[PDB]
Amino acid sequence: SDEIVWQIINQQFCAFKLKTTKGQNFCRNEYSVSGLCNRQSCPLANSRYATVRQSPKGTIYLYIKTIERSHMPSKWWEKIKLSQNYQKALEQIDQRLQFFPKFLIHKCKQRLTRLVQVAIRMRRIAAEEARLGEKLVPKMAPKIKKREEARERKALAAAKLERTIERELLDRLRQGAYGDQPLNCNPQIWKKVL
Amino acid sequence: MVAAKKHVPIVKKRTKRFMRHQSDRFKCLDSAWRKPKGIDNRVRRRFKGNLAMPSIGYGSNKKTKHMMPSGHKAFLVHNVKDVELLLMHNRTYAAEIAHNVSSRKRIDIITRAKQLGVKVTNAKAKVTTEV
Amino acid sequence: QKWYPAEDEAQPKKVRKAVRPWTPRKSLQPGTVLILLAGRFRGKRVVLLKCLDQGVLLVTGPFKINGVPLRRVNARYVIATSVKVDLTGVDQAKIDEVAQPKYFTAASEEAFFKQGEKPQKKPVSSTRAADQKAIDKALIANIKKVDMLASYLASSFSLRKGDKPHLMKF
Amino acid sequence: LPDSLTSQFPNLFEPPPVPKILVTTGINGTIHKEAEEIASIFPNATYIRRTAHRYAYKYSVREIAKFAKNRGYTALLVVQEDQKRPSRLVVVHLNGEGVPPGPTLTYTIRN
Amino acid sequence: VRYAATEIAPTKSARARGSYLRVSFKNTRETAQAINGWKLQRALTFLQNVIDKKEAVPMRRYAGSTGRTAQGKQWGVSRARWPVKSAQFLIGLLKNAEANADAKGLDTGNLIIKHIQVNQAPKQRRPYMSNPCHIELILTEAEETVQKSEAVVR
RNA sequence: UGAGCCCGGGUCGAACGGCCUCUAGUGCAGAUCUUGGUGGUAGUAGCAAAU
RNA sequence: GAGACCGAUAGCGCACAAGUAGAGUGAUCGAAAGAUGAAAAGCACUUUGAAAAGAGGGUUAAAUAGCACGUGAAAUUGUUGAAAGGGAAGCGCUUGUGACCAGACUUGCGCCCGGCGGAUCAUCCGGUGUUCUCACCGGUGCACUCCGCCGGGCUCAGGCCAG
Numbered sequence: 001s002d003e004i005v006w007q008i009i010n011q012q013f014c015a016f017k018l019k020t021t022k023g024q025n026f027c028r029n030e031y032s033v034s035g036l037c038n039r040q041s042c043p044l045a046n047s048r049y050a051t052v053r054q055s056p057k058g059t060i061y062l063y064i065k066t067i068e069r070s071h072m073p074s075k076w077w078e079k080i081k082l083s084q085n086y087q088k089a090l091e092q093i094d095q096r097l098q099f100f101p102k103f104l105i106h107k108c109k110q111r112l113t114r115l116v117q118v119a120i121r122m123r124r125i126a127a128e129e130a131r132l133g134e135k136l137v138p139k140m141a142p143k144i145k146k147r148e149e150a151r152e153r154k155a156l157a158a159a160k161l162e163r164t165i166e167r168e169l170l171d172r173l174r175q176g177a178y179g180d181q182p183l184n185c186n187p188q189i190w191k192k193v194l
Numbered sequence: 195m196v197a198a199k200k201h202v203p204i205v206k207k208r209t210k211r212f213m214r215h216q217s218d219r220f221k222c223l224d225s226a227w228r229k230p231k232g233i234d235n236r237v238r239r240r241f242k243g244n245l246a247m248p249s250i251g252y253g254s255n256k257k258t259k260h261m262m263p264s265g266h267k268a269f270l271v272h273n274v275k276d277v278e279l280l281l282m283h284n285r286t287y288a289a290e291i292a293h294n295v296s297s298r299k300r301i302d303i304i305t306r307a308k309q310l311g312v313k314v315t316n317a318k319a320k321v322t323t324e325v
Numbered sequence: 326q327k328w329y330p331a332e333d334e335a336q337p338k339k340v341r342k343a344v345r346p347w348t349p350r351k352s353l354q355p356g357t358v359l360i361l362l363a364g365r366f367r368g369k370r371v372v373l374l375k376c377l378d379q380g381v382l383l384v385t386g387p388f389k390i391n392g393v394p395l396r397r398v399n400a401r402y403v404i405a406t407s408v409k410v411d412l413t414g415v416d417q418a419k420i421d422e423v424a425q426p427k428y429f430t431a432a433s434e435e436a437f438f439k440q441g442e443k444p445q446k447k448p449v450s451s452t453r454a455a456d457q458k459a460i461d462k463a464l465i466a467n468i469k470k471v472d473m474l475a476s477y478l479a480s481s482f483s484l485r486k487g488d489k490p491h492l493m494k495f
Numbered sequence: 496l497p498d499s500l501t502s503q504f505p506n507l508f509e510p511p512p513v514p515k516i517l518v519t520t521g522i523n524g525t526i527h528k529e530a531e532e533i534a535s536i537f538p539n540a541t542y543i544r545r546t547a548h549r550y551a552y553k554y555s556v557r558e559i560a561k562f563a564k565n566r567g568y569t570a571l572l573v574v575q576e577d578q579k580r581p582s583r584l585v586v587v588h589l590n591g592e593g594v595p596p597g598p599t600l601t602y603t604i605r606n
Numbered sequence: 607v608r609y610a611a612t613e614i615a616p617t618k619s620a621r622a623r624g625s626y627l628r629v630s631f632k633n634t635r636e637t638a639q640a641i642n643g644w645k646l647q648r649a650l651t652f653l654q655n656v657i658d659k660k661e662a663v664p665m666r667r668y669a670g671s672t673g674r675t676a677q678g679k680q681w682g683v684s685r686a687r688w689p690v691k692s693a694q695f696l697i698g699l700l701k702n703a704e705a706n707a708d709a710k711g712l713d714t715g716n717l718i719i720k721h722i723q724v725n726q727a728p729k730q731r732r733p734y735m736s737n738p739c740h741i742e743l744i745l746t747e748a749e750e751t752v753q754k755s756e757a758v759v760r
Numbered sequence: 761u762g763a764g765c766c767c768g769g770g771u772c773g774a775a776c777g778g779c780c781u782c783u784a785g786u787g788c789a790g791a792u793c794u795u796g797g798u799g800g801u802a803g804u805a806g807c808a809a810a811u
Numbered sequence: 812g813a814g815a816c817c818g819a820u821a822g823c824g825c826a827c828a829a830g831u832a833g834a835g836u837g838a839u840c841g842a843a844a845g846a847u848g849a850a851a852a853g854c855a856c857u858u859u860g861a862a863a864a865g866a867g868g869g870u871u872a873a874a875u876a877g878c879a880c881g882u883g884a885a886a887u888u889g890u891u892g893a894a895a896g897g898g899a900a901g902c903g904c905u906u907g908u909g910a911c912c913a914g915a916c917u918u919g920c921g922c923c924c925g926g927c928g929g930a931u932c933a934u935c936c937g938g939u940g941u942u943c944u945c946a947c948c949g950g951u952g953c954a955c956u957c958c959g960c961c962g963g964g965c966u967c968a969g970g971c972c973a974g
């Protein structure tokens with residue numbers, strides 16, 4: 001009944017389906033070896049299936065599903081640890097997925113390659129952000145932005161900037177902060193002050 | 195080397211939009227295209243010097259349809275799980291964060307997409323750099 | 326190589342486009358006086374030493390006569406005249422040496438502090454200057470031996486009124 | 496019941512020397528005229544861009560602070576942009592002699 | 607990027623407003639356009655010399671052929687009229703802005719009319735419709751000029 | 761191709777969207793179309809009923 | 812008591828003063844009109860003046876939420892800035908000029924030494940869950956193997972446009 005569940009999934013409804021307007025559908029299922037909704041990549045409509053997933057520890061595993069455990073949703077997948085050596089992991093995928101469809105083997109090798117490349121890229125990126133020290137933070141929220149705009153308007157109104165500058169300059173002129181014979185003002189102006 | 199895929203050159207047969215006839219004169223007429231249905235309408239009869247109508251001959255190449263000038267196709271993302279779906283399609287698709295995604299979720303999406311090697315079109319959204 | 330192909334990236338098919346030697350014009354002979362049509366030495370008369378490959382020509386307008394250093398130029402940007410100067414005495418070994426396609430080629434505190442500053446115009450060389458003198462020595466001697474030619478190579482070519490290049494005899 | 500200020504910041508609080516100011520921008524900064532004007536505010540201030548071209552080395556603020564400390568600069572100013580307009584001001588006091596680079600004050604430029 | 611021309615300091619300007627005023631919009635707009643850009647005392651004398659009959663107000667956009675006298679020679683407009691009530695309302699708003707500038711601390715001898723805007727108010731529902739208006743004028747100080755000092759050598 | 765759709769910037773303040781099906785009071789340029797609002801005529805004709 | 816109903820030009824004419832205001836001699840006819848804010852905290856006080864009006868100042872998260880009050884479209888209007896024109900304007904195709912805006916490949920991998928640290932390495936030991944042969948912990952050490960990290964060295968691959 002692989003074909004019947006495929007017809008039900010593909011032509012009626014699937015909860016793992018992302019329909020895009022750009023010419024491709026995507027599979028939201030975590031065990032999909034390629035995140036695409038097509039006949040060969042369906043983890044549900046294929047009784048024998050294989051995928052490659054990476055644990056939060058960083059260890060990458062190969063997951064194999066057979067027809068004889070298909071009525072056992074808690075026992076669907078057997079998990080096999082893949083080696084850190086890339087070539088040895090490729091040969092492990094070749095050995096465990098012997099006599100499988102060539103599509104599943106090919107996509108498993110591609111997914112393992114992409115996961116190792118993403119791990120290397122992640123290490124390089126983490127080193128670069130550790131060296132630079134930059135970090136993205138959110139901007140001000142609209143309520144906080146409106147608050148700062150209104151209170152800055154009120155503070156600018158209450159500042160009286162030019163009057164304050166003129167008053168402080170005249171105050172500095174009175175108390176002799178510029179010294180005798182000030183270079184700032186005319187001699188008649190300094191005469192009037194005294 | 196990280197870019198889009200090798201693709202055939204992007205050719206747009208027409209860059210302008212098809213405006214509705216007499217929509218520049220009346221404010222009650224939107225510029226969205228409406229096919230003229232009058233018998234003596236010279237736009238419908240295709241007289242010289244008039245508006246062209248949209249035809250299937252104006253269609254884009256199937257190898258470069260829906261493709262941005264960078265070569266990627268836009269993929270709308272609402273959360274981190276959505277950018278994870280582009281693990282195997284980092285060279286064919288670019289992430290477009292949805293307009294109603296908050297700032298912290300945007301930071302989560304941008305960080306993960308950089309690690310996955312997926313371009314983000316609107317990465318200059320409501321975020322800023324702290325030293 | 327190291328990685329399995331992680332995406333269905335099609336390899337290119339084998340192109341049947343081989344590389345065959347460029348066949349120059351019959352007027353591009355060694356020693357022919359050439360009129361440059363483009364560049365910063367535009368309009369200056371030089372002497373072709375050796376025809377290189379893919380359209381490139383090794384030319385040198387004796388620096389003493391006209392200020393054109395040992396340089397390369399595309400053949401589609403030169404006009405070949407009927408005057409051919411004798412190259413007897415000019416060392417062909419030196420010409421072959423300069424004719425190799427690598428002669429005209431080339432994060433810290435100072436790297437940061439040099440950002441935004443104008444690059445310095447480099448002085449030339451002590452061996453390239455000697456190379457120019459080595460070729461020019463015999464070339465200038467032959468050009469002086471030729472009647473009236475030294476004043477010809479020092480004058481820049483230009484078009485006057487009424488002169489039609491289609492009816493000329495360059 | 497200042498004393499806590501001069502205990503916490505003895506370099507800022509025996510007269511300080513003449514200031515030499517280095518003004519820079521973000522990583523791929525586009526505010527060159529704005530940062531040049533902000534440098535022209537302060538006496539003895541030079542503006543140096545941070546990346547030269549698009550695909551060059553990305554120097555960090557700590558590296559630039561050490562570089563300017565080794566060249567006798569007194570303080571480092573970083574002008575960070577948002578929508579091609581100045582948004583943040585980062586003032587780092589490089590100090591001198593054996594004192595490490597001092598306190599960093601981060602302000603927001605709004606209007 | 608391009609930066610817009612920033613507003614003058616609020617310590618150097620004085621604003622007056624009048625809303626839902628029961629005067630005709632067209633006559634008030636023409637009167638406001640006549641006095642736009644002038645000095646304050648000149649506008650005071652013109653509005654007081656148009657309240658009592660000496661001086662004319664020209665009309666350019668909302669121009670009706672009513673009077674053709676020599677008083678329009680100085681404006682170059684052959685159509686000139688004398689609205690009265692708009693002059694009183696503009697006078698009241700001008701002394702309001704003068705009081706605002708005196709309270710704020712501005713020199714009232716160097717005040718010029720930076721901008722004066724007449725907008726339409728909601729129409730009075732009584733088919734005869736009244737045309738009230740809003741008036742928003744902003745006076746500023748004359749721009750002050752400071753002589754430079756010669757640059758020093760280094 | 762198109763009807764349209766997605767994102768950025770501003771404003772705003774409590775709900776909303778995609779997909780598979782179901783359903784309909786489901787798509788406007790016109791009907792001397794209905795209701796509301798607003799114009800040129802026009803500060804014109806005139807000081808007339810109302811105001 | 813409910814609904815695959817309507818949501819203020821809809822749904823009863825009437826969500827609110829509704830068979831009310833108002834019209835007609837009368838029988839009868841019959842509207843328009845909802846939303847501040849969480850809370851009136853509904854703007855004290857100083858100062859113009861006769862206003863259903865302002866300027867400071869204050870409350871509030873916010874007053875460009877001020878009982879003209881959630882948001883605030885278009886028609887239409889005013890101020891400022893730029894450009895063009897005076898025997899129609901408007902439209903299609905194609906360059907140019909000015910102003911403004913955006914910012915191109917998201918720009919990488921592999922080898923060879925030296926040091927360090929972990930392991931899927933050790934036919935090392937103990938434990939847990941299992942699809943019973945696969946996973947996961949804890950402790951040992953670096954003879955081999957494999958991963959990373961740091962300091963040097965080298966090669967290669969790289970987007971677009973011209974000749």
Ligand SMILES: [Zn+2]
Pocket residue numbers: 009014016017027036037038042
């Ligand atoms: Zn599917």
